[PDB]
Amino acid sequence: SLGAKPFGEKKFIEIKGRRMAYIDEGTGDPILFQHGNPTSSYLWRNIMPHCAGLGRLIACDLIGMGDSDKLDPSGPERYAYAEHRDYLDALWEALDLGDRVVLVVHDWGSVLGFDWARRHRERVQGIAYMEAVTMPLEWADFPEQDRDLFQAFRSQAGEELVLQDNVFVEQVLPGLILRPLSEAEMAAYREPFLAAGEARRPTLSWPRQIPIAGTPADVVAIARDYAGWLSESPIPKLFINAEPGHLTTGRIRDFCRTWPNQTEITVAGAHFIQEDSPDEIGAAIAAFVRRLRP
Ligand SMILES: [Ca+2]
Ligand SMILES: [Cl-]
Ligand SMILES: [Cl-]
């Protein structure tokens, strides 16, 4: 169902001298849920219950996000993709995931998850993805009404928009969910980001890292790498398409629809589709996992 209550209890682990927070419930092979910007493990709260008893249910808060520690000192050079990956790689190593992981990814969680999967192909049993970065982007893939705002994040105006005014959390997030959020739901999303300034840096560093029109060159290459790999990998896949959807439409959806061994369903939603169709998403992922783990 819908609901504002989180799934399980937050656990904490020391990684590269910082505390990272994660949910880890049940036993068996992991079903690993990865949020992106500006969200947290909370994004998956009404989806994870659908996988009850199908394995070990895990949702990690990225560094600087959810209940995970802020980097100190933070600044414009902090929270780049490479830095997030170092912390997540280390957390995933520490969680002892074994070699039959099912990944469930969204947004920046898809860039991180697709990259990890390419680098650890032998350990990946299945990949479920939605509203994901399926390949390097051009401004033309970028939803038309988002172009000016994201270009602004990727300019000097970004600090005032995000660090001062919390635009990603307060405007982009509800703007890309079709149903109205409750007070409690917004409270959960704004909590990691209540303080103006560097506390909000991850939500600004992320839009600056999106691989668009060749920049930044390092994230473009990582995305180019996994796009080529996924288009050839026989690993089973579940593509959860959205209507109207947002990011994974047009060219980049045309692209991910060429991926082998893929089941697709369509659900209602824009970008943060977890808030619009949690039960349909959860049911689809559960069915996917059941078939992978008969
Ligand atoms: Ca809305
Ligand atoms: Cl095993
Ligand atoms: Cl972003």
TrEMBL record:
Its EC number is 3.8.1.5. It is an enzyme of class 3 (hydrolase). It comes from the Bacteria. Residues 30-278 form the AB hydrolase-1 domain. The keyword Cytoplasm does not apply. Keywords: Calcium, Hydrolase, Metal-binding, Plasmid. Ca(2+) binds at P174, I177. The active site is at D107 (nucleophile), E131 (proton donor), H271 (proton acceptor). It catalyses: 1-haloalkane + H2O = a halide anion + a primary alcohol + H(+). InterPro entries: AB_hydrolase_1, AB_hydrolase_fold, Epox_hydrolase-like, Haloalkane_dehalogenase_2. Belongs to the haloalkane dehalogenase family. Type 2 subfamily. Monomer. This is Haloalkane dehalogenase. The gene is linB.
